């Protein structure tokens with residue numbers, strides 16, 4: 001039950017990505033440290049093991065989406081891919097923040113114990129940026145209002161997920177151990 | 182041309198002209214000759230500030246060589262009518278009518294710059310026509326001269342006979358002499 005090393009996973013990504021050295025080091029070390037944190041589960045001498053998410057930045061067509069997809073092939077824990085452009089501030093017509101967790105369970109076949117150990121990716125984060133330049137009465141929803149909702153999600157807390165496509169049964173799913181890119 | 186400035190507020194940024202920015206702080210500018218158009222504009226500003234805040238002092242900067250008398254008297258009654266104390270400052274020069282609005286300010290809130298100069302004289306006029314019409318306009322301009330001296334004594338504290346003798350001809354008063362004359366209260370040499 002030997003886990004992969006940063007060098008082994010890096011060579012695996014080299015066969016699908018070209019011209020990106022610094023970005024490979026981040027995902028390799030983060031994914032490597034992820035397995036160690038979940039494997040220990042505050043059972044070793046190290047108590048209250050923290051978390052470290054990743055923020056990828058680059059021009060369009062640079063290969064950000066490729067690293068998220070190619071990484072999932074070698075990855076054992078599940079993986080998903082969503083977009084925050086459609087997200088709203090808990091009640092508007094567009095979407096809800098918990099939709100991300102719904103797509104995550106489809107890949108894990110509704111396994112809460114296995115989904116918490118998974119990985120999540122977000123695309124088109126620039127659309128969430130402040131729109132109104134020190135906002136006014138309009139109460140921006142697509143922008144600032146979305147960031148504040150994600151705050152608790154990235155840190156870790158319980159949530160609510162529909163079991164089979166609802167919008168009277170809700171399952172609790174922690175997110176402190178879940179990684180976000 | 183007038184430069185534009187940006188004011189930082191909680192709601193957002195706002196572009197204001199240099200004159201409109203100062204107006205928001207209860208500051209009025211009196212520049213050039215006193216005429217019917219410029220005087221009617223200052224009255225609207227004073228009335229607007231009265232409604233916005235009746236307990237805050239107004240700042241009135243006076244730098245003008247004087248002008249029409251009737252245009253200036255409309256401002257004098259307005260300053261005395263409204264409740265707020267209209268603070269007056271003399272910048273550059275203060276002629277006959279410019280000086281009258283300076284001394285007409287609230288008592289104790291009148292200042293003059295260290296190099297300013299005040300000038301006071303009698304009303305100017307003229308007429309051309311029949312002798313009967315000259316007598317009518319002559320009696321009228323004489324009443325104005327008498328009325329302007331009565332009010333000048335009221336704010337300056339001097340006697341009516343003293344103001345009459347000094348206003349027969351042009352009389353220049355430097356900034357220190359204006360304090361001794363009761364026209365102003367002090368000088369704003371430096372900031373404290």
Ligand SMILES: Nc1ncnc2c1ncn2[C@@H]1O[C@H](COP(=O)(O)OP(=O)(O)OP(O)(O)=S)[C@@H](O)[C@H]1O
Pocket residue numbers: 016017018019020058059060061062063064065066067123
């Ligand atoms: N470094 C790369 N090596 C090989 N193919 C690449 C590389 N970068 C981009 N591609 C190709 O470009 C396609 C799209 O890559 P993306 O990751 O979507 O680019 P992008 O920078 O993520 O654009 P976004 O995420 O929509 S802003 C991939 O499916 C590859 O075919």
